[PDB]
Design a protein around this ligand. Structure first.
Ligand SMILES: CCCCCCCC(=O)OC[C@H](COP(=O)(O)O[C@@H]1[C@H](O)[C@H](O)[C@@H](OP(=O)(O)O)[C@H](OP(=O)(O)O)[C@H]1O)OC(=O)CCCCCCC
Ligand SMILES: CCCCCCCC(=O)OC[C@H](COP(=O)(O)O[C@@H]1[C@H](O)[C@H](O)[C@@H](OP(=O)(O)O)[C@H](OP(=O)(O)O)[C@H]1O)OC(=O)CCCCCCC
Lengths: 607, 607
């Protein structure tokens, strides 16, 4: 593990401490080095425990004048890579570029080291184990550290820009993925020009992303705003206001299945959620929502509630029969039972609701056969991804469909006790209509706030409430097991005591007492202790937690509405048929331009 | 007292005002001084009411040229200390160093005053009565005031650095204990070098602390960060990231019983709680918690709850017998009684739970015989110290053990009324499991918040609630003592009225009324006054207090979690056996180094 890295590092340092010749590199004493160079017995192939050469340590501890004599020992020394596990092999260039000393790199290129050699060690690949990521070429190091006078010097001696890597990242993806973008942006601009003398941009990696889409998904707005300016074309400017027109061949991504908007909304990182507030995408999504999305969404919502009221009104009329035998005991109340199937349908009044039952079962099967082919396309863990996409409103629909499908099978075989699935479906169907609050201006924050409140806060709190009610439940049960149950009906057996003390915890039911009899002695002090340890403070603390959760979400509603807006738009455009949705933008073919799509916008900004 | 200091100060000033010769010192007139020096009758041994000499007052009121003539009166004058109670004795150096005039100190050292003399007065020892603390040597004054040109001048004439004191503090402890650390740090660095030409650091005081441990416990982070840099050793630095390795012979304190972490967490001062966020200790405690503590803690918690459910399920089945005699009156409800011991165990169903009873009593005695030898080691007041250590979770465990131990003695002697200790144990055992919320990320703040809320806030508020319920209790009792108790059962006798009005204060029970009869006249207006003076405002004020207590703790949870983490770690490492816990760090013996332990860490910080 990391303890293995510990061990190999200290082993490397003690093996450096061992041998005197390679010690004289880091010691940097010229006289001992000249004496050792005088001897024949002093080899030139001494090697550390990790794969090493004398040139490596001399370049590592920043001694150029101590290395220029070892240049004249043998020119072989610049060509042997390491041979070990953690560092699979690195030449002297990989160490020498990162220290930026120009003279040592000039000496190594004068001797004739390999201009390009790939190095794939355990400490080089991208992972959260390491601290840096740079790629596997000397040009990648020279670019990303930010020394242009070694970039041009190394591009002069070869090292083509179009060169792939493990995981298939070119130099441009490396430059996009880094921090400190204000210094790397102009260097990106400088680096692109040398190859122009498919272009460099259009080649993807193994995952399937162009660098433009990568800069979209990784969440950096600075160089995105920079990179948009190449596609810009200026129109006339008269007085204060100006007019521009943007190219739209790669933002919309028409012919491709994997679009850009769906890719940028469904991202793990937070900062990508910001980049929808830039202009040439915000104007697009606002136009597409204002012109097409809202009527289709409102029609769909109206149809859904008109389905659900028909389900309720065909549910409430169900056939019943007078009970066979009389109650042979007290402690029971039941006077009707379930009717049998053969005598069920006799009349016209019975005949009407059969149409409603067929409508409900047809709606159930058609809503079942729509979400199940969705999850095979992307993956089960991704479809239940996070709250902006709408997972917890998508699980309840298929659960409702499964229960209302099971109800028919339970009805046909004449089974008693069909009240349970019908009751679960009747509560879930009305609680599931809350998903249609996306499409308004002032309800989306409320539904996302109650979702975050029920899944984030109560589940990490319920344990303390559970143990503090269970203790007093057992106490109140054992104090009342020697009295008449006719006089005080609560705390009779064990589960009724548990349910009653849970109800008494939430101040709903009132405290039981009687004045025609006498109660025992422990009950008063235990009830007073329960009243001042569970009712007063343990509930107000949770209410204060609830208010503090509300305050954090209530600041950024104007930013949080638009993300679920565009997610609803892209999903509804994907599932609906093709003929209803036309294209977007302007067709540039008739106006003299060739086979592209454009958008335009004007601005009052100058003075 | 301090009035005695008042009296001795004004008495000293009026005795200075009395005699003319010593008055001419503070007056600083040369002609009268020369006239008095001309006489033989003018003594040189005039003395104040407090022990004094003419040289003392002349040095105190900053007159050097008025003192250089009295130098030639007699060279004896620089050698007599005071002889009194508040200032037990001070030479002229003790006053002269604090005023920083170089020439007077040069004259006194030219005459040959004592270079080192110890002064232990009532106004010199460390106490919250005084305002300053400096030690008992002229070198201590010269160091702590911050004049290096008198430090080197006085170290040139002797005054060894290795010199103890009352309470056994060297010069280094004096320099650590002071404020204004930015000026004293470089002087500490300067002062350490002169003795190097056991070292000075390793000698402790009478309480048993080295200066490193003292700087730990007193809570100053600046010079701790300074003093750590001596032990640092640098490894290779390549590119942006660097690597270092820290020495660990004195932080961990392996062989000693009194460790450093236990000493620094159990401190009265607040600021020490900060110093766990420095790097070479935070990395250590995070590694030790992530690798070893959590599995042992989770196993222990699982075993404890599996014990407690067995206790509850062997508690709920207890033997009972039908009552002997019928109820000869109303106002009573009881139909079962306690079974006698001789007829208790007849059957296999009775035979099963005896194993559970033996398991509970064995667990009780083994949990009793573990916390009692702890309190003899450190002291009773210290084991119940404060909330981070866990006092109020340690008192309830031994109280539970005592009650469940008493239950057996009450059962064997056939005593009636064994419901009371069993009920107290059954509520305390389940409320005591809340201690195991230390080991999670998001429950520690909640348990510390409810602890602070119940011990800090309610106890200082309950008095007002008590008197305002007692008044209305007595009023409602005296208004209803002339009516039939069959019609309105509350307020019958005095304690039922008190309990019922306490229940009505907290809005739990509903307000009693009847409509088949007529009530008296005072009841309506007294009930309305009670409803708008006790229910509405007096409760919402306490709820607002509760919210304001929550807000203060909810800011610093990320700092407050780690202290109880490391306290749990050090306690669990102390009590568990030796074989399960290995050492920490790296053994430096095989790598060429000699018999020390090291840790390493790397950093991406430079650019
Ligand atoms: C059948 C398959 C079932 C799939 C179920 C699908 C489960 C599912 O999709 O929702 C999971 C839930 C959703 O939240 P989400 O995926 O968006 O991810 C973040 C997570 O909720 C963090 O708790 C929040 O951190 P914080 O507020 O900043 O502090 C963060 O808010 P913010 O960063 O935007 O501000 C959230 O965005 O994430 C959890 O909380 C897991 C911890 C649960 C804790 C449970 C403790 C017991
Ligand atoms: C059998 C022996 C029994 C041993 C019992 C053992 C008793 C026991 O161990 O807890 C005592 C309790 C614990 O608090 P603790 O010891 O940590 O000390 C501080 C004390 O609580 C202050 O009230 C707080 O000041 P403030 O919040 O800043 O304003 C401070 O908070 P903060 O500084 O961290 O912010 C606390 O840290 O201290 C009291 O309140 C005593 C006053 C009681 C008042 C009672 C009034 C009637």
């Amino acid at each position: 593990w990391e303890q293995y890295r510990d061990r190999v590092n200290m082993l490397q340092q003690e093996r450096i401490r061992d041998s005197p010749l390679l010690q004289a590199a880091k010691e940097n004493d010229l006289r001992l080095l000249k004496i050792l160079l005088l001897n024949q017995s002093c080899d030139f192939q001494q090697r550390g425990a990790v794969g090493e050469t004398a040139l490596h340590v001399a370049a590592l501890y920043d001694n150029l004048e101590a290395a220029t004599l070892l240049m004249e020992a043998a020119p072989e020394l610049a060509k042997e890579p390491a041979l070990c596990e953690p560092f699979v092999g690195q030449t002297a260039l990989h160490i020498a570029v990162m220290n930026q000393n120009l003279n040592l790199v000039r000496a190594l290129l004068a001797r004739g080291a390999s201009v390009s050699a790939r190095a794939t060690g355990a400490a080089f690949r991208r992972s959260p184990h390491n601290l840096i990521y740079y790629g596997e070429h000397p040009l990648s190091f020279a670019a990303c550290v930010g020394s242009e006078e070694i970039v041009r010097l190394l591009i002069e001696h070869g090292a083509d820009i179009r060169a792939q890597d493990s995981l298939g990242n070119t130099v441009l993806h490396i430059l996009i993925l880094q921090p400190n973008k204000t210094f790397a942006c102009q260097m990106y601009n400088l680096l692109l020009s040398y190859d122009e003398h498919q272009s460099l941009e259009l080649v993807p990696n193994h995952q399937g992303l162009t660098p433009f889409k990568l800069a979209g998904v990784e969440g950096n707005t600075v160089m995105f705003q920079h990179l948009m300016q190449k596609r810009k074309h200026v129109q006339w400017t008269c007085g204060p206001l100006t007019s521009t027109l943007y190219d739209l061949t790669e933002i919309d991504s028409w012919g491709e299945e994997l679009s850009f908007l769906e890719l940028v909304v469904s991202s793990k990182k937070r900062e990508a959620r910001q980049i929808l507030e830039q202009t040439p995408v915000k104007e697009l999504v606002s136009f597409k929502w204002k012109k097409y999305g809202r009527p289709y969404f409102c029609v769909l919502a109206s149809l859904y509630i008109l389905y659900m009221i028909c389900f309720t009104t065909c549910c409430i009329y169900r056939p019943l029969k007078l009970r066979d035998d009389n109650r042979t005991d007290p402690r029971d109340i039941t006077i009707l039972q379930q009717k049998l199937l053969q005598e069920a349908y006799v009349t016209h009044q019975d005949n009407i609701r059969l149409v409603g039952e067929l409508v409900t079962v047809t709606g159930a099967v058609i809503i079942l056969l729509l979400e199940i082919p969705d999850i095979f396309r992307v993956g089960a863990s991704r479809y239940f991804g996070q709250t902006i996409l709408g997972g917890p409103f998508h699980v309840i629909i298929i659960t409702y469909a499964s229960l209302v499908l099971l109800t028919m099978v339970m009805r046909l075989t004449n089974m008693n006790g069909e009240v349970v699935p019908l009751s679960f479906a009747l509560v879930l169907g009305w609680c599931s209509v809350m998903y249609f609050a996306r499409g308004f201006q002032m309800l989306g924050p409320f539904t996302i706030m109650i979702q975050k409140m029920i899944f984030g806060d109560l589940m990490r709190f319920c344990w303390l409430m559970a143990v503090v009610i269970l203790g007093f439940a057992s106490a109140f049960h054992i104090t009342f097991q020697t009295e008449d149950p006719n006089n005080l009906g609560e705390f009779s057996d064990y589960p009724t005591a548990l349910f009653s003390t849970f109800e008494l915890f939430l101040t709903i039911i009132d405290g039981p007492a009687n004045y025609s009899v006498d109660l025992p002695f422990m009950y008063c002090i235990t009830y007073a202790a329960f009243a001042i340890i569970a009712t007063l403070l343990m509930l107000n603390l949770f209410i204060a937690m609830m208010g503090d959760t509300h305050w954090r979400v209530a600041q950024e509603r104007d930013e949080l509405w638009r993300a679920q807006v565009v997610a609803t738009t892209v999903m509804l455009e994907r599932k609906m048929p093709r003929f209803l949705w036309p294209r977007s933008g302007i067709c540039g073919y008739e106006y003299g331009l060739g086979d592209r799509w454009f958008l335009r916008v004007e601005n009052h900004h100058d003075q």
